[PDB]
Amino acid sequence: LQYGPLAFVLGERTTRKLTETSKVITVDGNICSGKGRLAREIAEKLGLRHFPEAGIHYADSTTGDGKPLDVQLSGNCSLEKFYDDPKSNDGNSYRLQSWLYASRLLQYADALEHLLSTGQGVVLERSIYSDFVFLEAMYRQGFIRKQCVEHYNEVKKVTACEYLPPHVVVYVDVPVPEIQSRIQKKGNPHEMKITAAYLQDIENAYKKTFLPEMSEKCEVLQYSAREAEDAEKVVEDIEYLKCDKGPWPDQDDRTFHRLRMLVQNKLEVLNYTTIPVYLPEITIGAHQSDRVFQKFTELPGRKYSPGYNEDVGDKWIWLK
Amino acid sequence: MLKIIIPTTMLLPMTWMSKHNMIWINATVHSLLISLISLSLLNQLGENSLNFSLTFFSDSLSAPLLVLTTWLLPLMLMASQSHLSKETTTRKKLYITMLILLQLFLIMTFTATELILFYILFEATLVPTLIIITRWGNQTERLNAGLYFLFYTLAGSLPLLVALVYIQNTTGSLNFLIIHYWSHPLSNSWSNIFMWLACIMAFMVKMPLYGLHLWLPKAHVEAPIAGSMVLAAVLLKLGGYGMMRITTILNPLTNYMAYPFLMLSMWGMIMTSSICLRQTDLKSLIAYSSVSHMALVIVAIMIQTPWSFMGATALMIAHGLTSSMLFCLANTNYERVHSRTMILARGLQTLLPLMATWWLVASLTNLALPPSINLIGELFIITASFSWSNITIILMGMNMMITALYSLYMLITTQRGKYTHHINNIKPSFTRENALMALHILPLLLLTLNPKMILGPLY
Amino acid sequence: KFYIREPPHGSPDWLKVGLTLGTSVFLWIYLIKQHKEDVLEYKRRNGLE
Amino acid sequence: MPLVYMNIIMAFAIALAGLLMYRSHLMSSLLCLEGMMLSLFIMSTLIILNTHFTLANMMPIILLVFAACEAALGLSLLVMVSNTYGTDYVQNLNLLQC
Amino acid sequence: MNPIIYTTLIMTVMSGTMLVMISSHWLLIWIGFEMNLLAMIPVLMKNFNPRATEAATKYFLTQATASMMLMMAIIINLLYSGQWTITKMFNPVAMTMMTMALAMKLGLSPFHFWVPEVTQGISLQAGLLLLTWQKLAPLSVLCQISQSINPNLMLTMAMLSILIGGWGGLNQTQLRKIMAYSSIAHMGWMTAVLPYNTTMTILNLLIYITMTLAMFMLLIHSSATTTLSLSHTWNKMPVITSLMMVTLLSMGGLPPLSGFMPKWMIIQEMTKNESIIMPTLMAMTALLNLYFYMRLAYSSSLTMFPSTNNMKMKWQFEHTKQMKLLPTMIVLSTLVLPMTPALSSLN
Amino acid sequence: TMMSGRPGRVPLQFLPNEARSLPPPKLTDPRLVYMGFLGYCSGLIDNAIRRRPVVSAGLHRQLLYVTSFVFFGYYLLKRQDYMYALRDHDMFAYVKSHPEDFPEKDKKTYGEILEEFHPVR
Numbered sequence A: 001l002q003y004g005p006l007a008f009v010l011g012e013r014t015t016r017k018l019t020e021t022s023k024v025i026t027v028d029g030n031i032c033s034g035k036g037r038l039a040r041e042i043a044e045k046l047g048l049r050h051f052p053e054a055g056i057h058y059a060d061s062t063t064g065d066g067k068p069l070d071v072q073l074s075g076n077c078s079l080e081k082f083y084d085d086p087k088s089n090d091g092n093s094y095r096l097q098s099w100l101y102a103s104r105l106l107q108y109a110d111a112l113e114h115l116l117s118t119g120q121g122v123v124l125e126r127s128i129y130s131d132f133v134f135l136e137a138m139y140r141q142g143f144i145r146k147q148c149v150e151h152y153n154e155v156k157k158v159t160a161c162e163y164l165p166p167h168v169v170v171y172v173d174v175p176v177p178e179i180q181s182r183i184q185k186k187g188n189p190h191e192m193k194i195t196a197a198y199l200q201d202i203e204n205a206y207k208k209t210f211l212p213e214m215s216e217k218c219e220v221l222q223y224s225a226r227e228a229e230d231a232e233k234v235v236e237d238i239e240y241l242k243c244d245k246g247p248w249p250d251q252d253d254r255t256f257h258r259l260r261m262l263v264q265n266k267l268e269v270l271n272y273t274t275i276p277v278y279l280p281e282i283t284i285g286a287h288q289s290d291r292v293f294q295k296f297t298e299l300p301g302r303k304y305s306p307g308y309n310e311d312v313g314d315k316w317i318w319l320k
Numbered sequence B: 001m002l003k004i005i006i007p008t009t010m011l012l013p014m015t016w017m018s019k020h021n022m023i024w025i026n027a028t029v030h031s032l033l034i035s036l037i038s039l040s041l042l043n044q045l046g047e048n049s050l051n052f053s054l055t056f057f058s059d060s061l062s063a064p065l066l067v068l069t070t071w072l073l074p075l076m077l078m079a080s081q082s083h084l085s086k087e088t089t090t091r092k093k094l095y096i097t098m099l100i101l102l103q104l105f106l107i108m109t110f111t112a113t114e115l116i117l118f119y120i121l122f123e124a125t126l127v128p129t130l131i132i133i134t135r136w137g138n139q140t141e142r143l144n145a146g147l148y149f150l151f152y153t154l155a156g157s158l159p160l161l162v163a164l165v166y167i168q169n170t171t172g173s174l175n176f177l178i179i180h181y182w183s184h185p186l187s188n189s190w191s192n193i194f195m196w197l198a199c200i201m202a203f204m205v206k207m208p209l210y211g212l213h214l215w216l217p218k219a220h221v222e223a224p225i226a227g228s229m230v231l232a233a234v235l236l237k238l239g240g241y242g243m244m245r246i247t248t249i250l251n252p253l254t255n256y257m258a259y260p261f262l263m264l265s266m267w268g269m270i271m272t273s274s275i276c277l278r279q280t281d282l283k284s285l286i287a288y289s290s291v292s293h294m295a296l297v298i299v300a301i302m303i304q305t306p307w308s309f310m311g312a313t314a315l316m317i318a319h320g321l322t323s324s325m326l327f328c329l330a331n332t333n334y335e336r337v338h339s340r341t342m343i344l345a346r347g348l349q350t351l352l353p354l355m356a357t358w359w360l361v362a363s364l365t366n367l368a369l370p371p372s373i374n375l376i377g378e379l380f381i382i383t384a385s386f387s388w389s390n391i392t393i394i395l396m397g398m399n400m401m402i403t404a405l406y407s408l409y410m411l412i413t414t415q416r417g418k419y420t421h422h423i424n425n426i427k428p429s430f431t432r433e434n435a436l437m438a439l440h441i442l443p444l445l446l447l448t449l450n451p452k453m454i455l456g457p458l459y
Numbered sequence C: 001k002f003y004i005r006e007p008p009h010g011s012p013d014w015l016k017v018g019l020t021l022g023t024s025v026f027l028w029i030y031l032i033k034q035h036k037e038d039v040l041e042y043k044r045r046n047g048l049e
Numbered sequence D: 001m002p003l004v005y006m007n008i009i010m011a012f013a014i015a016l017a018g019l020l021m022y023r024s025h026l027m028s029s030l031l032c033l034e035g036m037m038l039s040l041f042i043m044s045t046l047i048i049l050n051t052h053f054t055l056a057n058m059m060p061i062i063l064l065v066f067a068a069c070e071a072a073l074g075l076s077l078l079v080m081v082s083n084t085y086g087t088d089y090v091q092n093l094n095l096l097q098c
Numbered sequence E: 001m002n003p004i005i006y007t008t009l010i011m012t013v014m015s016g017t018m019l020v021m022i023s024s025h026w027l028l029i030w031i032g033f034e035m036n037l038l039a040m041i042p043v044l045m046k047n048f049n050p051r052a053t054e055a056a057t058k059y060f061l062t063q064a065t066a067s068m069m070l071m072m073a074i075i076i077n078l079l080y081s082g083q084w085t086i087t088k089m090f091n092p093v094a095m096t097m098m099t100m101a102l103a104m105k106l107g108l109s110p111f112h113f114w115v116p117e118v119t120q121g122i123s124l125q126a127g128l129l130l131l132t133w134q135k136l137a138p139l140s141v142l143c144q145i146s147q148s149i150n151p152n153l154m155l156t157m158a159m160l161s162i163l164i165g166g167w168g169g170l171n172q173t174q175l176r177k178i179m180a181y182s183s184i185a186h187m188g189w190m191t192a193v194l195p196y197n198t199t200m201t202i203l204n205l206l207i208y209i210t211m212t213l214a215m216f217m218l219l220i221h222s223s224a225t226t227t228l229s230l231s232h233t234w235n236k237m238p239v240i241t242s243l244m245m246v247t248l249l250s251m252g253g254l255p256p257l258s259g260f261m262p263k264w265m266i267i268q269e270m271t272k273n274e275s276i277i278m279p280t281l282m283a284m285t286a287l288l289n290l291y292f293y294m295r296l297a298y299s300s301s302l303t304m305f306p307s308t309n310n311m312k313m314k315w316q317f318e319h320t321k322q323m324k325l326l327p328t329m330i331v332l333s334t335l336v337l338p339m340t341p342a343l344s345s346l347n
Numbered sequence F: 001t002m003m004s005g006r007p008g009r010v011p012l013q014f015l016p017n018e019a020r021s022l023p024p025p026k027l028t029d030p031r032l033v034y035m036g037f038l039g040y041c042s043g044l045i046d047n048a049i050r051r052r053p054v055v056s057a058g059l060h061r062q063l064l065y066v067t068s069f070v071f072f073g074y075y076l077l078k079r080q081d082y083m084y085a086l087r088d089h090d091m092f093a094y095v096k097s098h099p100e101d102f103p104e105k106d107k108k109t110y111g112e113i114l115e116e117f118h119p120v121r
């Protein structure tokens, strides 16, 4: 059987399953840092599972076939358009921010489910708790509105209040001039349109809010570019962080049961991401909603439940 | 009656199992076949009814109503497929399912032999109608129209349920044959007055009586075309059928209690015709015309003579056909210009000649032009009213004059004059619309040829 | 292999299918036998056949 | 009926009117609730002892037992309310409305 | 709460109700009520928050008061008869106390406020259990003692319940409070028929339980607790909205749905006893319940409200947990009108 | 409670021994067919709610739905028929035992009965 109250009664215990290397590690940094490479190295050396940054189409990758869906059907927002016209009149910026928050929430639920069902640790390239720095950068640059910020805060409260924070937070500090240099060398025009004040706002949010907040929960490791280049010393520093003042020691079998029941149900994870707060940016009319939902239903392996789609080669439907 | 009931319940699975592009074809063809089969019910008797079984029976009053219902279903399918082109297959099938369910309930309503089963079905017709209105209506006011329709009908009909169960406890039976053979006079007492009120008020609300009629313009204007067609042609006639049936047990109290309802009916007939004279909306004009004609039918039932019942039956059938046709014509105009205002589209005779002919014929039948069955029913009601009293002729003549005035006013306003210059999308009439009008109008003239088929049991 | 992740109901649960069919067949044969016994007992008690 | 039964029933009525008329504290209402069961105990044992219903003598004990269960339940709810709001006042139980 | 502790508390609630239903001794009936309440409080407080704590406190206070009044009635009856068996009560004062206590337990007006308050306080599963089972027990006691019920008191409380339920439901916009006021009205109908035919009381109880189970399980499936939350369900699973609309039509008492059968049978049965004004008023007042059911049906299925942007991700994902007997509850609550004469089997 | 407590009633007995002398329902009873129809509707609703093909998927499950409904409907119909037969039996026995309360009245023809005539005009 899949995990449930009967499995709990029979004796499946997360505490027994864990192997004391089951750590949640999140790597953070400004735009265009080495956090992806450092996270991959940490996951490889420690034997943990790597979770690349949850962009658009992450939910597409986790469901159906791994192939991404049409942007009209998955996200309805554009990072390139956010770079091109940040002060758009169709709410693209906040649509993108809210969709990316929901994607990060879903990825965190996926990572927690993997850790609780396997005991193997995970390394996320960014988490729920680091997502608001882009919200503050957007607000301080005039891209979004105070109502957008308030809606974001409501959803973040009622959603992220329910999960366990990371064991280890690894922050890679790179100065803004170096960030701009690397962006220019990369050569992508959309990110070359990023202003320096936007990059400074993200760093200000990271240094002033996220890092002080995560210090109370557990320990925070900060590295420069040179230190982040040498990942062996990073893994050595991780392996000797024997202290753990987070809620994980306080977690018990019943609390783990509740958490696992939550994280194995993806519709309950995203329950409050769609609350009836009618912001003009995110609200979608009845007619457009109906048209897009019909199109998604018309998608190849999406009309019925996964085991019941005959047009993708599912057989024995009449006895299933 | 099972040979007609089962094919409808088989229209249901056929509709849900047919292909996505064959739903309209299948539904229309098999509705026409069921209508042809139901034509066999017109072979009635002169002495008694057709007692098929313990549950269903047919009479000279039920048979034309069943034929009209079965004939109206395919026409509603044609109009619906006009206005529901872009819908999804599931929602098209749901619309056809609502229409089929409504037809099944109406068939069992007209053929139910017990007052309680008749009540259950005649109240069951509310759900498909309400769903159709409040789901597939176009404007915002469909929700309020559905609320008005539902609550008027239920406020009328709940005391009817109480009265019916009381009568079953009192006499032992609600079978129509038994209550006809074992009927006793209703003594003049307050209890009997309120029993009479319960029954008659249920059916007067369904009719509607003048003053209890606002739900009718609200619902008939705001419903989709199939909803408008079934609301006017058939659903208004449940009140007349019920009032004719239930007045067996209400004598002689009907002689004394009919004065307020006769006064309301005659004066409100005048008032609704006068309203029709000054209506800025076409659908509202047709709805108020329906109210006037049903007022005449109420007068016929209340005066309650063999000549008045025949006129009432004839007028009910004729009004069903004529009002359905008028609604279809107005709907074609609306599908052109997307507005219900009467003065927006003019010169439609010089833009669409054959539709002008259809408008002329429908408006000539709407006013009583001899020898149409509309006139036959109106004239029989007028003669019975003249025997009742000799000033009813004054009120009836005034009503006929105003009816001719507003019918020809509607025709002249929509069809004659000069076309609106800026309306440049009046495409030529479709074969489907032309065939819809022909199928509305030819049976009316054939019924003129054979009029004893719609004169009821008293013939 | 369309799905990146194996569906929970990808393959029929043969144990449940067999139990379902067996339960349906058992209920039907039990109903037939019960009706036959009921008819026989009714006839015997009423002295018909 | 003797006047003793009248006094016991009057005590029950007084304790019932005390419960139904809150002032501020939830504890005072709990004490009113405990008085009602005390009066019920006394009335039951007076009725049983007078009539020599021998097998019914155990009924007041069961009555006391379930009085204890009710008192325990009420005290548990009171500690939860006090933890949430800082006081046992009944004015704080106003989040839910009719 | 541990799953084992939760299931043992559910079993204790059920055991208290079953003790009430199978006992022949007034002391054992009281013990069953006490056991039910004691095990029922933690079920309400299962998800700890101030609203749940407040709802459990209000429920405990009301039920403790009702149990105290019930025991006083039992003792007064014993004083004047020396009888512990549950039969016709031998003292009118004891009968009045018993009627008041059982009405307070059921939530009949004017003892109704705790019903909407507690139901809004507790979760959907807890509200489902509350309404269903906690109406199931006191009604069995009332049916046992029906032959001594004062018709005037019972019918007054029943008409008050119907009126109050209609009006409160008219005002409410939260789904749980709507359900609570609907429950108050249905209890009014059942107790109105109670002094004439306990069989009709049982029939109404069964139909109400079926409709309430279907409705609450549809709400749990759709995870909707407000009107606007339920307005997003057409863009995720349009089938659930349609089933909910048909169930709402059934609850409002429209023919030929299963909600018409109890009202029909009760009107008929009361008319047999020469009651006309009461059935007519009861039938007319149910139009209020139908109005707010129809208001709920407009928002969720008959009109398409605006949705949000994360509904796309919700589309990508699938509902995991399967409701037990939801299709059966949907069918039984809408399509069993042609099976009406089975109430004789219920007899 | 009319028939609750009728003498000789065994508690918690769905069908007593005296019900065996009644004709059992025919297996093609329209009420049994309607119970099977309810089972089929439940199966279709199950497929629709779980997002399987409504008519095709879960044929074994739909068969189980229909079979369970027909089974329980058969036993329910037997109990209903037994209760109605019992009611008629009791009513007839009481009428037989109380002739002074249920007297036979002499039948008068309509030639002897005088009824007031109310003209309609």
Ligand SMILES: CCCCCCCCCCCCCCCCCC(=O)OC[C@H](COP(=O)([O-])OCC(O)COP(=O)([O-])OC[C@@H](COC(=O)CCCCCCCCCCCCCCCCC)OC(=O)CCCCCCCCCCCCCCCCC)OC(=O)CCCCCCCCCCCCCCCCC
Binding pocket: B012, B013, B016, B017, B088, B089, B090, B091, B094, B097, B101, B127, B128, B131, B135, E238, E239, E242, E243, E245, E246, E256, E301, E302, E334, E335, F040, F041, F044, F045, F048, F054, F055
């Ligand atoms: C048998 C034919 C039907 C007769 C009905 C009579 C009454 C029976 C009641 C129970 C019926 C069984 C349960 C059916 C559930 C179906 C759910 C569903 O998914 O439907 C779509 C489904 C196909 O679509 P899909 O692929 O599932 O995609 C669904 C997506 O939502 C597609 O995406 P979408 O977004 O395009 O779809 C959205 C749609 C999706 O929404 C739905 O599909 C929901 C449909 C209604 C919910 C179920 C209500 C059940 C309660 C009883 C009342 C039912 C009346 C209407 C029945 C509709 C049946 C489909 O929702 C809306 O558009 C919202 C509309 C809201 C207003 C209308 C809905 C409420 C109508 C009912 C209330 C009125 C009742 C009046 C009182 C009288 C009642 C009798 O249709 C079917 O599978 C058809 C079912 C029947 C198949 C044929 C069975 C017989 C086969 C042959 C037998 C031969 C016998 C032997 C003959 C002798 C010669 C051999």
Ligand SMILES: CCCCCCCCCCCCCCCCC[C@@H](O)O[C@H](CO[C@H](O)CCCCCCCCCCCCCCC)COP(=O)(O)OCC[N+](C)(C)C
Binding pocket: E206, E336, E339, E340, E341, E342, E343, E345, E346, E347, F004, F010, F011, F012, F013, F014, F068, F069, F071, F072, F076
């Ligand atoms: C696998 C096959 C399918 C099985 C599905 C089972 C689902 C139903 C479970 C069975 C329920 C009935 C239990 C049968 C054994 C118990 C025997 C006992 O309970 O039966 C009688 C009592 O049984 C029930 O009372 C009647 C059972 C019938 C109820 C179901 C039909 C309800 C009518 C609804 C009509 C419209 C819907 C039609 C059905 C779809 C005993 O009488 P008694 O002990 O002295 O009652 C004392 C209290 N009284 C006098 C006040 C009544």
Ligand SMILES: CCCCCCCC/C=C\CCCCCCCC(=O)O[C@H](COC(=O)CCCCCCC/C=C/CCCCCCCC)COP(=O)(O)OCCN
Binding pocket: E015, E016, E019
């Ligand atoms: C699933 C378990 C069994 C289910 C029973 C079937 C349902 C019936 C309802 C419950 C009945 C339980 C029977 C207990 C009643 C016993 C009464 C009795 O007979 O008295 C004793 C019985 O004998 C005993 O000692 C029995 C002792 C049993 C102790 C252990 C019982 C286990 C209880 C488990 C607690 C579960 C909680 C139940 C929920 C609360 C109650 C609803 C015999 O006395 P004698 O002196 O022999 O009388 C003759 C005089 N010469």
Ligand SMILES: CCCCCCCCCCCCCCCCCC(=O)OC[C@H](COP(=O)(O)OCCN)OC(=O)CCCCCCCCCCCCCCCCC
Binding pocket: C016, C018, C019, C020, C023, E323, E324, E325, E326, E328, F046, F061, F064, F065, F068, F069, F072
């Ligand atoms: C006596 C108890 C009666 C109730 C038991 C209910 C148990 C199931 C509850 C969950 C909801 C219904 C099932 C939906 C599918 C669940 C997932 C699945 O694939 O199930 C497969 C299962 C196969 O059946 P299987 O379990 O083998 O049968 C019992 C064998 N001993 O598939 C099935 O079992 C599907 C068919 C279920 C039975 C039909 C539904 C109940 C019928 C009741 C008949 C009486 C009518 C009145 C009912 C009143 C409410 C109980």
Ligand SMILES: Nc1ncnc2c1ncn2[C@@H]1O[C@H](COP(=O)(O)OP(=O)(O)O)[C@@H](O)[C@H]1O
Binding pocket: A030, A031, A032, A033, A034, A035, A036, A053, A079, A096, A097, A100, A101, A131, A134, A135, A191
């Ligand atoms: N919440 C967000 N809002 C807007 N843009 C975001 C958000 N999260 C990530 N991005 C964008 O996604 C891209 C990810 O780049 P990043 O992974 O930081 O580079 P690197 O892989 O070099 O570390 C960046 O261009 C960043 O602007």
